[PDB]
Design a protein around this ligand. Sequence first.
Ligand SMILES: *[C@@H]1O[C@H](CO)[C@@H](O[C@@H]2O[C@H](CO)[C@@H](O[C@@H]3O[C@H](CO)[C@@H](O)[C@H](O)[C@@H]3O)[C@H](O)[C@H]2NC(C)=O)[C@H](O)[C@H]1NC(C)=O
Ligand SMILES: *[C@@H]1O[C@H](CO)[C@@H](O)[C@H](O)[C@H]1NC(C)=O
Lengths: 305, 629, 277
Amino acid sequence: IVTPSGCGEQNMIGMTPTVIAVHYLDETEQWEKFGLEKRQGALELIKKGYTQQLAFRQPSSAFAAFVKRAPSTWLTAYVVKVFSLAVNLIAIDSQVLCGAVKWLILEKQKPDGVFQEDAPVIHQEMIGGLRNNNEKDMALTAFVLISLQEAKDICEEQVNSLPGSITKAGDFLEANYMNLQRSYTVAIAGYALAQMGRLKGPLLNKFLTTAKDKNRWEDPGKQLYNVEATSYALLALLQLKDFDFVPPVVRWLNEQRYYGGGYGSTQATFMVFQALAQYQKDAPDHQELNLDVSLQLPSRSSKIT
Amino acid sequence: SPMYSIITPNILRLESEETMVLEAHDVPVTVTVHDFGKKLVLSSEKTVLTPATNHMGNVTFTIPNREFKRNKFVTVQATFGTQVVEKVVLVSLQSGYLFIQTDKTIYTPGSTVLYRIFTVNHKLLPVGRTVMVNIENPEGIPVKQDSLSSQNQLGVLPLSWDIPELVNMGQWKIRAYYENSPQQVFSTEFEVKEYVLPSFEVIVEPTEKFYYIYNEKGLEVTITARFLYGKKVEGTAFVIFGIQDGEQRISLPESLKRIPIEDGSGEVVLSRKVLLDGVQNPRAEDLVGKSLYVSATVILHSGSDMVQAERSGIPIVTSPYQIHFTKTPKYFKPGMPFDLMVFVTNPDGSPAYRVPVAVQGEDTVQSLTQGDGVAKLSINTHPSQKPLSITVRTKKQELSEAEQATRTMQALPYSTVGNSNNYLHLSVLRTELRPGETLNVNFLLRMDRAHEAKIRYYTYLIMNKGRLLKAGRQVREPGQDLVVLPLSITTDFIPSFRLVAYYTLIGQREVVADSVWVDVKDSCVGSLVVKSGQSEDRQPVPGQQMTLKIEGDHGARVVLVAVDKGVFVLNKKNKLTQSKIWDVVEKADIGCTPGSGKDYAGVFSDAGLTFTSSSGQQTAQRAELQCPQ
Amino acid sequence: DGDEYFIGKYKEKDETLFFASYGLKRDPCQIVLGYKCSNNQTHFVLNFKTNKKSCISAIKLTSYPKINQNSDLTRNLYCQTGGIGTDNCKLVFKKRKRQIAANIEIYGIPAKKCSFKDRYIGADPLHVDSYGLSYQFDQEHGWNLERNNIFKDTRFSTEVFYHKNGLFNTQITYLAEEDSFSEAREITAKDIKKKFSIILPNEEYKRISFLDVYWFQETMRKKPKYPYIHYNGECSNENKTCELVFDTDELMTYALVKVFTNPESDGSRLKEEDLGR
Ligand SMILES: *[C@@H]1O[C@H](CO)[C@@H](O[C@@H]2O[C@H](CO)[C@@H](O[C@@H]3O[C@H](CO)[C@@H](O)[C@H](O)[C@@H]3O)[C@H](O)[C@H]2NC(C)=O)[C@H](O)[C@H]1NC(C)=O
Ligand SMILES: *[C@@H]1O[C@H](CO)[C@@H](O)[C@H](O)[C@H]1NC(C)=O
């Protein structure tokens, strides 16, 4: 339970639990324990937080920490993604979102093919353990690619240069897949890469072998990576519909059982709960069952099937 | 402009028609239904409020869809020209009933089974939907399943099955349910066992249902056997007794008797000594709570037949009565008198008749009971806010003082603000209400003693079958303390109804309310009569013809079946009767408490009703499906 | 073993609509799942109409015991009112004296986003057609011959109409060695009328040189009535957008056109005995 209140980033860290709760209680409907007879109050708080987020917009058609703060790629694109998830759920101006996406396309497109966001991150409470600026470029390039993919179903016709940019990014990063050390960012980048189907063969072998002990995708420090790390692969394997390493993913998820919320809970928690959502929707408690039996007797000219 | 209030049913059932009561306390209002994130829009309605009509909106609409596959909610909102009020409610799936009829009760291998299915909705009217039916063997694994639709048939489905020649024995089951909601099922049982049809019937009966442990005559039973076509019988009978405990039976070998049955009449007597010696319990008082049963066998003088009859469940008790508090409000009334309704029954559950009750604390405060075994009493209050305990004791005459039943009950106070403390209760003789009669709801009232000349009216609602049947409005002029509602009881009120009333007072904000539970006589609203249109000369002869006369309402369908009366001797369980229908429809209501909760939210939410106000003076919510326990 | 008859093509991701087994001497049928049939000395017909939102994909029938007769030179299964793509059609089967059983299955796919272009277009459109038989040409003129081992029919002279597995065919003109494949176009059942047309481009290096049409339809009796597929006006170099117009006597349920392109075509190419009235 984290009340959505404060500035843009605090409102964001308070409202992504709203979305994960929305999905998890669309599968369960346990809103009773979301405040002890406070579900309507919680929803009202969520709505006022969303209204405050809208009020913090800028003339540049972007949302930041404040009306005066310089807009950035990561925060604005994340807000766009969440609103896209909630276009049919809450009052979302689709034209505003598409205009923001097109401004993102027309402004922040470096000729080098590597995208960078303007405002540096100061606090590590939301990013995680990647404060060091060593391989952030590839992660942000993958994030921009994911933004383009999600805008592909929303702003398909307004910008027609999307296939060319995607092809250029894939060609540039095709030989750069062999120059990464940290495992969880490799996992999320591979999930994005396979979201359009570009992860197979030896690339998949290096993907799997990157994790420690072939199962745990841990990095030095930030133990909250655990219930996070394999989560990425699951969604990646959700793109490949591979449920052979997903069970080990599940086993390593259950080995921590950390409460979470707050420190570093801005992308891992949403990703793991959406992954659980599609895992339960596609794979219920039961498994596939389909049999055909045919028996033939020596005294009849037909067979019973 | 001051306030706007919405009254809604607690749970709304999909694919039906529901209502809201809107009370502005010359404005257009609109209501709308949205899903829970936001699934476009479901429905909306527009209405206007007229001062000449006291500003009452009886807004009705039909709730639809196929996406509705745990439990889920829905939001209802309403804008009254300028201000919006909204509330979230639950949606359920139970959307009708299913009744199953079979021609016979016990079958043999090689025969055929013929059955019928009736489909009805909440109001008990014909409907048409899709149903599925399974047949289950004794172990549990289904043998045959099928799916059917009952469109353009007015709601009767006949079917058939054919038992094989080489089949198992015992109990078989039929299970049917709607296609939309597989969570709820309806079931029926029948037997499979080879037999041969008997020729006469045997009846065993005692003289007293109970058994007082202090009698020197023991227990006496009588035996009556008769042929099927009406003539008397002769023969010999063997009788034995037993003792029944919770899943346990003990046979007393010393109690076995042979008696000659002449003209169908035999007498058997059991004494104290045999019963005491059969068990290892010299202390008689340890026997209370254990039952008796008797078994008999009758043989003819020609050595041709053999019939067995068993009666089980003769209780052993020391008090020939019993007291209950199933339908008494639990929260008392500070200042104003508190009314109790006792319930007295025979030990077998049959309601008693003409037995007086009283209270040990007071004197001469007594009454009798009508045919339903219910007595009405009243008691004054302290009126200190300390909870009070009351006791009830039977005061029947011509009986010893040591054989009177009694019990105790506790009450809790009511939490008002500012000491308004206004209630409702009908001061009429609680008798056998009948359709077509009249009722006089007497508002026994006690406002604030200081400035009680400000209240102008009250609001009242009638609840039946989990829906708002009617909403009224009765006014009064300042300086009065008693008003009457002459209600006219119609046929739609069957089998029971709940009246809820309230009023609003200017403080801060005051709202006061109460509720009452009333019951009416039970019988089908229509009428079907079957008799013999023949001249009724003499008894018929095999192969003859006769005339059968039917009377019923216009434009109906009548289905018939004739069964021999020798089958019922072998197995006489699981039949169809109107009492079963009323029991089934009554057992699935919403509000299970008699009424008069702890406060206004309590009384409104304990009768399956929801009240929302523009000032935020709302009620709590519920998200389960059945009341506790 | 038993003989088999097909309608349509099967795919590994289809769910069954229903599956049943029938005897072929009882009178009348056994009513299975509330459906209707009719059985005579030389006919077996069935009525089908699904309730869920789905479009049918394939039908298959198996008969026992084996009999000495091939199953590709004539027609034995055909449904009379509907077809493939429409949610219902009335199957008709013609028996013999020695067939005493049948097994029937139907497959379908979700109604909204169902299209059949991914199957009948094949994996190598330049070398194999939808039937499966590969093309083969004449080395001295470079014009394809006529496949001969399938049920073929003619209306008048200089016309051809093939049939196989419930799929018809009609080749507009003759094909050359150096043709190329441009694209394919499909027409679903919601855009089908008694008479309609279709627009194709002929801009520069997209010159149309070959068109072959595949379509399902219905037949009242065993003798079909092939529709008129003529070539509106003349598609020369000048008129860039060229139209194809249909003229049907019975209602179809699906169509598919495989445009071929060749920049060298002058618009006219005909055999030395096809030409004079
Ligand atoms: C045994 O049953 C089959 C059908 O189950 C019979 O074939 C069908 O017979 C009907 C009745 O003659 C034919 O309908 C007729 O068609 C004409 C065509 O113009 C039309 O005027 C009418 O609709 C007329 O009823 C139908 O064409 C024919 N074939 C089908 C349905 O495919 C068969 O004749 C029966 N056997 C015998 C010996 O009658
Ligand atoms: C050919 O050009 C003429 C010019 O009038 C036009 O009418 C006709 O439709 C064109 N035919 C095709 C097949 O495009």
